Amino acid sequence: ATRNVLRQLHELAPSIFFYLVDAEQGRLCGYRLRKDLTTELSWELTIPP
């Protein structure tokens, strides 16, 4: 978490996405990174277990 890395992430935030899979509930989620290293929900899918 250096200053240069923090600046680069502040510049490049809206181009990085996370996707998570929960097998117990069969739920897939996808978030997008924000400027201040926070995340917001973008997409969601469900498969009935």
Binding site: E44, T46, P48
Partner: protein, 150 residues
């Protein structure tokens, strides 16, 4: 029998979640048909949409799962929708048993060339709606091989 599903759309300046009712989907399982009933945009809605498209915002669509039991949602660039004269396509992916799995939204054509669109081109929803069940994978054909081997 026919069922009804709510369909909400959201767009904001700061890219938050402010979903509100947009339309209703009528789904008939017997013949497997899907139809949409919606309303046209208001004035301040058009202004806010133009601002969102200017600020490279997003346009989110959400439908529930049970015709507060859950939601399925997706998003598309707003500028790619404004420049397309509100011509878009929605696909509803369903399970094998008949459970709603997902919703997808696309526009034709894609991309953002930075054109200029006036207010008179934002009055109608050229929207297509499609349903999608899973296909069936093929198997290893052998009878033709056996008979040709003879």
């Amino acid at each position: 029998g026919t069922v009804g599903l709510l369909l909400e759309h959201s767009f904001e300046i700061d890219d938050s979640a402010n979903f509100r009712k947009r339309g209703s989907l009528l789904w008939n399982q017997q013949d497997g048909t899907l139809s949409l009933s919606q309303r046209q945009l208001s004035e301040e809605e058009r202004g806010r949409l133009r601002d969102v498209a200017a600020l490279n915002g997003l346009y989110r669509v959400r439908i529930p799962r049970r015709p507060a039991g859950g939601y399925v949602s997706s998003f598309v660039p707003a500028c790619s929708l404004v420049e397309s004269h509100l011509s878009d396509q929605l696909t509803l992916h369903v399970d094998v048993a008949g459970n709603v799995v997902g919703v997808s939204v696309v526009t034709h054509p894609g991309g953002c060339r930075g054109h200029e669109v006036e207010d008179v081109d934002l009055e109608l929803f050229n929207t297509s709606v499609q349903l999608q069940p899973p296909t069936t994978a093929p198997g290893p054909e052998t009878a033709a091989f056996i008979e040709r081997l003879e």
